[PDB]
Amino acid sequence: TGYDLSASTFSPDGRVFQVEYAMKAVENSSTAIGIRCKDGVVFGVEKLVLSKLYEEGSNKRLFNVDRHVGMAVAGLLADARSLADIAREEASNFRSNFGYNIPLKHLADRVAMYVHAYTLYSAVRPFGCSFMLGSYSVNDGAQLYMIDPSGVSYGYWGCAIGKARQAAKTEIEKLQMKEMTCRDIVKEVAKIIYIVHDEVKDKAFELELSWVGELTNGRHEIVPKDIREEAEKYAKESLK
Amino acid sequence: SAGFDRHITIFSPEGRLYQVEYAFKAINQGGLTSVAVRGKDCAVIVTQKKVPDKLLDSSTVTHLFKITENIGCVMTGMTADSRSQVQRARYEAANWKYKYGYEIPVDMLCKRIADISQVYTQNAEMRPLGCCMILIGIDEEQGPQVYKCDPAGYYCGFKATAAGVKQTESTSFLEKKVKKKFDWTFEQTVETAITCLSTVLSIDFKPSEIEVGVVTVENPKFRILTEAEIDAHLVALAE
Amino acid sequence: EVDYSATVDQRLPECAKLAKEGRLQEVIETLLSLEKQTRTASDMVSTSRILVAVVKMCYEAKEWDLLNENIMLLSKRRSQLKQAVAKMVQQCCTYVEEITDLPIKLRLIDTLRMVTEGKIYVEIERARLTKTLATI
Amino acid sequence: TTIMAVQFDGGVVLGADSRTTTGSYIANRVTDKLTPIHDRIFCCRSGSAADTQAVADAVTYQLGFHSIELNEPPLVHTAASLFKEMCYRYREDLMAGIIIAGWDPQEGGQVYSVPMGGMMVRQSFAIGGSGSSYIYGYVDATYREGMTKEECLQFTANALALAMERDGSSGGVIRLAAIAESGVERQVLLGDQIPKF
Amino acid sequence: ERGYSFSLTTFSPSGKLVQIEYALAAVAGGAPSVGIKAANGVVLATEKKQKSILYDERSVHKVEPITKHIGLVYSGMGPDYRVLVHRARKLAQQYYLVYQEPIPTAQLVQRVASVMQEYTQSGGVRPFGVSLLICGWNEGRPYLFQSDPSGAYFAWKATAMGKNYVNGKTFLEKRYNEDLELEDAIHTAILTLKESFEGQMTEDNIEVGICNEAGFRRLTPTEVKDYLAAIA
Amino acid sequence: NQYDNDVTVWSPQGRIHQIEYAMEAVKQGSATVGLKSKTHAVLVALKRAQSELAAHQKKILHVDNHIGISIAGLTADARLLCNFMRQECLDSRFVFDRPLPVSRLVSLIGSKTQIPTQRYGRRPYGVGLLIAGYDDMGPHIFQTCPSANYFDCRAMSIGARSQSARTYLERHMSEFMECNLNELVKHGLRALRETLPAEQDLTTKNVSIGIVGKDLEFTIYDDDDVSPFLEGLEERP
Amino acid sequence: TQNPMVTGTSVLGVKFEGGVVIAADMLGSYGSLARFRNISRIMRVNNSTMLGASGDYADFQYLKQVLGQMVIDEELLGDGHSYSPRAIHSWLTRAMYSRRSKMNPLWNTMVIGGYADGESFLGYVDMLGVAYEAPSLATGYGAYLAQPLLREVLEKQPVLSQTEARDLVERCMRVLYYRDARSYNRFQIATVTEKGVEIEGPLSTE
């Protein structure tokens, strides 16, 4: 109280409270897990359909930052969409001024700097959405970076953002992402997401998958519906 | 007294700026410790490398950032603000090179960094960057140099130093060590830095928990010691 | 954690026979490498076994100077497991009274006190060694 | 001037004249048209000296900043992009053609030609400057594939040598540089070393 | 009147710019500094103590030159002093360029005071928490001025700022004679630092600068050692 | 509490309360139903008259030939968003000579609304827009709540007493796809009529109908024009 | 762009039932000299549209980056909508007309042709902004030499075949080689049909 009304006021013990509040806000949303294959990066987000009137694909949380970069925002959807727009702008500017696809590391660093610049001013508030960036390139392998409201962003072999981040990590650490390919890893992602789901507190959800790697010629595209069901079939096979 | 600690540009009754001290304290939020030791012909810095998750990528967590091939930095404190300051330092070094030719000396580099921080603290527009910036680098005519220059805007010349949660203990250990004049050799400097960190943290210092960076007169280029070199230095330290 | 104890049981008497042959040295190197591997592998039981066996071989062979060097080397080893060093110091202090020559006993007591100085686990062993030194 | 580059397997060899004439007078006879833009990248300056020099430093700061930020050696195409943007934006005022050659661990040794007008294209060999309209025929009849370092130098030495004699704006001494994975070697041919006829 | 001790752009009922007084207190709570003006030259001395033996005493200098014949010593917040010195150097060089004559001490001091006052007129900008003490030798007459965060400048003959400034001022008016010389002025300044100096005065802990007709120059540790040994 | 004044202050629980209040701003307006069949996107809105002898307030606005909206919220923000969408549609026509996609316009609206919810200086756009349009992918019925989040809905309904319309649309979602213009309009009118209290009835003076189809440009039916659709509606039980 | 430095030859394109075909030379002639001879003057924008232009290749190259990012953004949204050949044409017309109004126009006479929803599109926006729809278009000289020929084939028979289109341009660029001082005997052919956009080449002549 008193030191937590603005993002530019350091707490007496040395902690910017608004950033922690944004982290809590992102913690208040659904789970989104990114798992790095041996030859790609797979994104999976549990997209809760708040009402039956939605169009099975509305407000999807999987965004294509660029051709090779996939983003798996989870949290305040408006902030996530704004961040996706800024990431696309940065990717376009990097390609125009340098001529080659912006490396996932550099794009993540620039977007993280942009996010952190919004937790330093009193006239702006920290982004309430945490996002993970994924891409594949033979030149630089598959990279999966997660940037939260605080602005910190280091690479991950596999990360989960949302309500059941800890539950997702418990059953993701039990997966060998070092060697597996992006074919069975999709089924693993579907199963892990289905495990981390209340199903009594959340009425229903529409699993949406995504991947980028060698199997997709290096580009990031929505997982084909033909094989997406196979992942859904495996998840259903898993009892939870 | 306590009602003046909500804005950075308001002076306390006794003549203090409370927000700058608050940022100094926030420096410790990362829970890490970093130490720099300036040898006779070398400058070595060692910082903790905490990876409290099996899914993290240990290669992307390193806190030792290379501002330039000849100048080095280790950010301690808040990660995001530390990375922002590292990017600003890289920009400052590049601009100095572009405008004056010769590489900007480390002292000048983060003197510019500290001036930026101070201008931040004077005009109440942005929260001060809560991240201590420890610089190293061989300077012609002045031997190895390590400069710590902090949020409030203070930069000084250091024979040895440290920033982080365990700063007072590490500095006391260095003072106990720095006083017995002896051959400050590369191996000796690295050993003393690692020993100070181990005693302050009271840890066995597994090779994957530390990250070291050394700049030497013979090789005046920032080099991040790999796991093998760190392990060899540790085994030499033990015996 | 790998539990090299089974391997140590077989590799101990083999090297012990060569050590009792008299050449030693190479036995010292082999046991040193085995101890390094075991300690890096968290082999408390086998590490203690190897330490005690090597100290026993050094003492039995009468390599007094070698005994001192090896005692110090194994005591100052990287991340040396506490229990193994404790048992090694216990064996050394059990041998100290056996050795009768005043100079050799004094030197061994000095090395044992140096190794155990500032250690809580071998604190009572240090007290006993200090009492023995005071008596001598 | 006469700046030429030719890429071989595992590296690239580039060379340029050492003549810089202010109208009808040679102000400098020891000019260097082989500008090091990075550890393993160079740019050849042709056209207005001030425009060539200033754009050289400008590209260095951007690439040098970029190289440090990515902690990975810059791609030659990265050098090509910056020159094209800088020249095209300033083309109506900037008169200078930059031929940039270098090696990267991404694809190998490449040479990119940016003639006056912000034209960016990658080719095995490229000759620019006023003297380029003199060795065009002789260089074409000598170009081949698979040249080694020794073969490349003999090509570059003669190619520039032919134009130097046939052109009046290029002269002085021969500058060459070999850029590859191992490193960069800068050799200067003066006096007898330059082939004659 | 606790309600008006916050903003620098509002007047208290009694008519006190509270923030300026608080900044002056912060200045008086800094490192000691004493300067004496002699008929031949001026002397500036500040105590340079680092919190531990781990600090390079030579890396940061409290006494810095503004031009060939102007000096600067401070007592308070050093980071603010760095910007103050940068502005002073810029002002001196601007005056030199416009007039091609080294900026007189009076004019440089006045412009530095104007720079200081520039920050005490708008909310959101903290007054400079350092009071500068300027040396000088222009027109063959030694000068000594003090510029404060309030913007006011005076012509101190000899004064001590920072911690224990009352004791320094009391020491002055006792050992100060208007007809001294540079060496005697240096000795008096060293003694004045001593009476407000905690611990041994090592060569690396006290930094002094003579600013006579020859110009301003920071005495190297050797000369400071010689002077302290002579006094000691 | 004290975190209830600005959009740039984060509540301890993790909510920007000002955004919640902007969202609540929708319910102060009249109920509006928007629904789409295979070829048509019809949205029916209820018009409220300030006085008995005052023209009923316009609720269905015209944006472009293929993009219609219903405003359920602040008149100020509703009109501002309508003007911005009109400008975007005109720019798309001028530069591309092609109808600006409804999805892209909705995304632009969301992006523009997000900024007021992230930077101090102006309140969030307290208007809920039901965007109906026809493009290459068929009819689109979006809802752009003040929270800067838009949902692509088959048949949405915002405004006061809108829950009944939403429930009816959920019940009859199946028939919406394979229905003609008349049946779609009648279902929308039934959804609106469910929202009204028992006494009030769907009269020709307080219903506005907007339709965009395969070959039919946007049309706003008011007063008698609604009569052909209104007649034949089953009397409410 | 006030004094072109590297320019281009003519660009030819004739529309047939089922798609459209375009071709262009690969000779970048700075002034009268063949500065470059391996450049591509016809690159695709999307699966159902392709373009190629004359004039300053640098100016056109700038257009390549703009369209690529401008085109790439199209699929990033993943909404299904893609810039129709008219859509790109309309953007181009305002793109250059806006640039010309500020005395810095792109000295790059473009031609954009594509196949969309069963109809072919062949537009040409000149270096200044003029644009129209014709069954067959040729830039620069091609209007003088190849363009007159294409009316004769279209006037008597406005319907053509892919092979009839293939040689027609060949008989079009062949005459370009004979009576032109800036042509080159290495050209690409761009075919756009339901199967997509394909670029192949070069090709020579007797």
Swiss-Prot record, chain A:
Assigned protein family: Belongs to the peptidase T1A family.
Predominant cellular place of this UniProt entry's protein: cytoplasm
Keyword set includes GTP-binding: no
Short name of one Pfam family: Proteasome_A_N
Function: Component of the 20S core proteasome complex involved in the proteolytic degradation of most intracellular proteins. This complex plays numerous essential roles within the cell by associating with different regulatory particles. Associated with two 19S regulatory particles, forms the 26S proteasome and thus participates in the ATP-dependent degradation of ubiquitinated proteins.
Induction: Down-regulated by antioxidants BO-653 and probucol. Up-regulated by bacterial lipopolysaccharides (LPS) and TNF.
Organism: Homo sapiens (Human)
GO molecular function annotation: ubiquitin protein ligase binding
Oligomeric and partner information: The 26S proteasome consists of a 20S proteasome core and two 19S regulatory subunits. The 20S proteasome core is a barrel-shaped complex made of 28 subunits that are arranged in four stacked rings. The two outer rings are each formed by seven alpha subunits, and the two inner rings are formed by seven beta subunits. The proteolytic activity is exerted by three beta-subunits PSMB5, PSMB6 and PSMB7. Interacts with AURKB. Interacts with CDKN1A. Interacts with MDM2 and RB1. Interacts with the C-terminus of TBXA2R isoform 2. Interacts with DNAJB2.
Subcellular location per the Swiss-Prot or TrEMBL entry: Cytoplasm; Nucleus
Modification Phosphoserine, positions: S238
GO CC, one annotated term: extracellular exosome
Residue list for modification N6-acetyllysine: K52, K201, K225
Protein name (Swiss-Prot/TrEMBL): Proteasome subunit alpha type-3
Glycoprotein recorded as keyword: no
From Swiss-Prot, chain C:
Cross-linked sites for Glycyl lysine isopeptide (Lys-Gly) (interchain with G-Cter in SUMO1): K76
Keyword Protease among record annotations: no
Keyword field contains Metal-binding: no
Keywords: Acetylation, Intellectual disability, Isopeptide bond, Proteasome, Ubl conjugation
Subunit description: Component of the 19S proteasome regulatory particle complex. The 26S proteasome consists of a 20S core particle (CP) and two 19S regulatory subunits (RP). The regulatory particle is made of a lid composed of 9 subunits including PSMD12, a base containing 6 ATPases and few additional components. Interacts with ERCC6.
Similarity comment text for this entry: Belongs to the proteasome subunit p55 family.
Protein name: 26S proteasome non-ATPase regulatory subunit 12
From Swiss-Prot, chain E:
Modification Phosphotyrosine occurs at: Y4, Y22, Y74, Y119
Positions where Phosphoserine occurs in the chain: S5, S12, S14
Modified sites of kind N6-acetyllysine: K68, K169
Keyword Electron transport in annotation: no
Keyword RNA-binding: no
Gene3D superfamilies on file: Glutamine Phosphoribosylpyrophosphate, subunit 1, domain 1
Keywords per UniProt: Acetylation, Cytoplasm, Nucleus, Phosphoprotein, Proteasome
InterPro entries: Ntn_hydrolases_N, Proteasome_alpha, Proteasome_alpha-type, Proteasome_asu_N, Proteasome_sua/b
Post-translational changes noted in the entry: Phosphorylated on tyrosine residues; which may be important for nuclear import.
A biological process from GO: response to virus
Gene Ontology annotations for the cellular component aspect, listed alphabetically: cytoplasm; cytosol; extracellular exosome; extracellular region; ficolin-1-rich granule lumen; nucleoplasm; nucleus; P-body
Induction annotation: Down-regulated by antioxidants BO-653 and probucol. Down-regulated in response to enterovirus 71 (EV71) infection (at protein level).
Description of how the protein assembles with itself and partners: The 26S proteasome consists of a 20S proteasome core and two 19S regulatory subunits. The 20S proteasome core is a barrel-shaped complex made of 28 subunits that are arranged in four stacked rings. The two outer rings are each formed by seven alpha subunits, and the two inner rings are formed by seven beta subunits. The proteolytic activity is exerted by three beta-subunits PSMB5, PSMB6 and PSMB7.
Cited PANTHER family: PROTEASOME SUBUNIT ALPHA/BETA
Family assignment from sequence similarity: Belongs to the peptidase T1A family.
The protein, known as: Proteasome subunit alpha type-2
UniProtKB/Swiss-Prot annotation, chain F:
UniProt key word NADP: no
Molecular function as annotated in GO: lipopolysaccharide binding
A single cellular component GO annotation: cytosol
Keywords carried by this UniProt record: Acetylation, Cytoplasm, Glycoprotein, Immunity, Isopeptide bond, Nucleus, Phosphoprotein, Proteasome, Ubl conjugation
InterPro entries: Ntn_hydrolases_N, Proteasome_alpha, Proteasome_alpha-type, Proteasome_alpha1, Proteasome_asu_N, Proteasome_sua/b
GO biological process: immune system process; negative regulation of inflammatory response to antigenic stimulus; proteasome-mediated ubiquitin-dependent protein catabolic process
Gene3D superfamilies: Glutamine Phosphoribosylpyrophosphate, subunit 1, domain 1 (3.60.20.10)
Quaternary context: The 26S proteasome consists of a 20S proteasome core and two 19S regulatory subunits. The 20S proteasome core is a barrel-shaped complex made of 28 subunits that are arranged in four stacked rings. The two outer rings are each formed by seven alpha subunits, and the two inner rings are formed by seven beta subunits. The proteolytic activity is exerted by three beta-subunits PSMB5, PSMB6 and PSMB7. Interacts with NOTCH3. Interacts with ZFAND1.
Stated name of the protein: Proteasome subunit alpha type-1
Organism whose genome encodes this protein: Homo sapiens (Human)
